[PDB]
Symmetry: C2
Subunit: 361 residues, 2 copies
């Protein structure tokens, strides 16, 4: 099954995105939850899954981290189960992502799902990132204040009670708070952006690991000074320009970024097939009609001519086939065209499959 977003994108972009929060009434028409509260909890029981439980009694809070052996000593009110990146683990929930590809893939994060009993929620906070909160079964009251991870109470600019299929969009910076009125499922479609710090330090590691930027400062026309202990401004400029020059070299930064943002912020369900596929086995499967499916949560992005998957750079002369890898979550032989006839390309595919990044049926 799949989901249709009822929403005017150019307007939402013009007037809300990264600017102003809004509640989209029945954004999803006749919304059907892709996962039961039961399924969700059973999933948080597993260790590879980043979950959390938030409770408030007597005015004080209580976070407990997953996984979870028992699901009692728990009240009937005032707690919330929050599970990170469920699109990594449950094929149906990953479909909630697809209608947001009107926003660029590289900026999309994953999907957090929360389950709360009446009164349950996390209290007033703010996020560094864009979010869409989709209301599933039940009902929740959400408050959002103007812009200024706990914060002090705030006057609300939006105060609404979401009904199934409603979507609350919140830009980064706006404080929000939400709690359940009946037993509620919320699906947060989250976004990500790097800060300058993450950029500078990650690019440095690439430079360092790959032995680049190995040219030395040279001063054949070394300037005079009055005090030998001084470092002069022009000298400082020269050092700066070495750094600018390296950042601006056409290939290196592009190539590092690709390897950086193509990585996920949460653990993937990587399960290498045994025995490994032969490039022939891949060819046969495809031509027989089998469907090659991308692993949930696995980011695949194109920067110029290169394509990157979970850190790996992928190069191939078959531009349209390679495009298919990045745009379709489910691939068939037609998507590849005559690229399947190049054994170099089959080989490349087979590697990706053996790494666990795509799998059959």
């Amino acid at each position: 099954m799949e989901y249709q977003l009822t929403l005017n994108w150019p307007d939402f972009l013009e007037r809300h995105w990264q600017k102003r929060p809004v509640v989209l009434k029945r954004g999803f028409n006749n919304f059907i939850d892709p996962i039961s509260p039961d399924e969700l909890a059973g999933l948080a029981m597993e260790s590879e899954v980043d979950s959390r439980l938030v409770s408030h009694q007597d005015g004080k809070w209580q976070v407990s981290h997953g996984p979870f052996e028992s699901y009692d000593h728990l009240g009937e009110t005032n707690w919330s189960l929050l599970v990170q990146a469920v699109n990594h683990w449950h094929e149906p929930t990953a479909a909630l992502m697809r209608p947001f590809r009107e926003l660029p893939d590289w900026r999309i994060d994953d999907l957090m799902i929360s389950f709360s009993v009446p009164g349950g929620g996390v209290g007033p906070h703010l996020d560094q990132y864009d979010v869409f909160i989709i209301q599933g079964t039940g009902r929740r009251r959400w408050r959002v204040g103007a812009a200024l991870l706990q914060v002090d109470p705030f006057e609300a600019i939006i105060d609404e009670e979401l009904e199934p299929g409603d979507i609350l969009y919140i830009p980064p910076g706006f404080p929000h708070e939400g709690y359940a009125l009946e037993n509620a499922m919320n699906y947060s479609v989250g976004f990500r952006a790097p800060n300058t710090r993450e950029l500078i330090s990650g690019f440095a590691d690439y430079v360092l690991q790959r032995e680049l930027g190995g040219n030395y400062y040279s001063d054949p026309d070394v300037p005079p000074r009055a005090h030998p202990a001084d470092v002069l401004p022009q000298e400082m400029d020269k050092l700066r320009e070495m750094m600018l020059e390296l950042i601006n070299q056409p290939e290196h930064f592009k190539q590092w970024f690709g390897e950086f943002i193509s990585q996920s912020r949460h653990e993937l369900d990587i399960a290498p097939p045994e025995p490994p596929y032969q490039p022939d086995e891949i060819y046969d499967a495809l031509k027989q009609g089998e469907v090659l499916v991308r692993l949930g949560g696995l980011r695949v992005l194109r920067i110029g001519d290169d394509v990157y998957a979970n850190g790996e750079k992928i190069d191939s002369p078959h531009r349209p086939a390679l495009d298919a890898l990045a745009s379709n979550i489910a691939l068939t032989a037609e998507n590849f065209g005559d690229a399947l006839e190049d054994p170099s390309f089959l080989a490349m595919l087979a590697a990706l499959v053996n790494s666990g990044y795509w799998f059959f049926e």
Copy 2:
């Protein structure tokens, strides 16, 4: 005692520095070695000292690292003892440095001293750095080739036999080779420069340790694209500009560099006094005529208004007193003027002394 360099600096800079090697005949007139071969070897016996022994027999080489218990099983020919940063450990040798402050302090490294028996030396190599090799007692034949850490044999553009007080200058990149003809002391005054790699990775650590560059990429006018998996050039530009912007912020980079180049490339002889000095004790000493002496090898550099010593930033409103710290290896009360009357400044001095960076007599 102290040393006088007989040499025309503007010409040497115009025509040789970072351009072309040259032998300066009797650069030091009536040269007296500041250290015996005995003293040198005894010093390499100590563990805090970076030494090395290079031998060749039968065509093959043999490096052994310090320190050294016994000084036999050693031939009469074909070996060399090389000791790193002797200016850190032997007050007299540190004076060989002073006449090179016609070149900027920040570019000067330390002083390596080698002792070789006839035939001893390291064979054909090249360095990434400028050097002046001063010939002490004895005689050595040095060869230098044109420019292109072992290398293949080379035709020589300079082939000379140095006599005491001669100085061989070699820019970075030029292959050289030298061996003893009689028992020879060589004093290498070494230089240093950073590469872009060292810059980018060190600045990143500063950004990271000090919690800077924490602004996030924002795209309120996020661009349209045909394939949602693409990252567009303008997006890449925006990311780059975040990095340029941070490097160019007036204070941060200046401040990091200061903390970086003010550090030594070899271990210092840091010996914190016990008990610590009181700011009064410092004041008294100075006014009584005692001489405050900078620890050997300790770099002290000024960048704009700030002054940096072995990593520490030093700020004080007494600009000329602070200047004295960077220009004089030996300080007296006069050097400080009325800054000694500010207890804030005495306090600052006392800290530096207790760290072991300066000491009395």
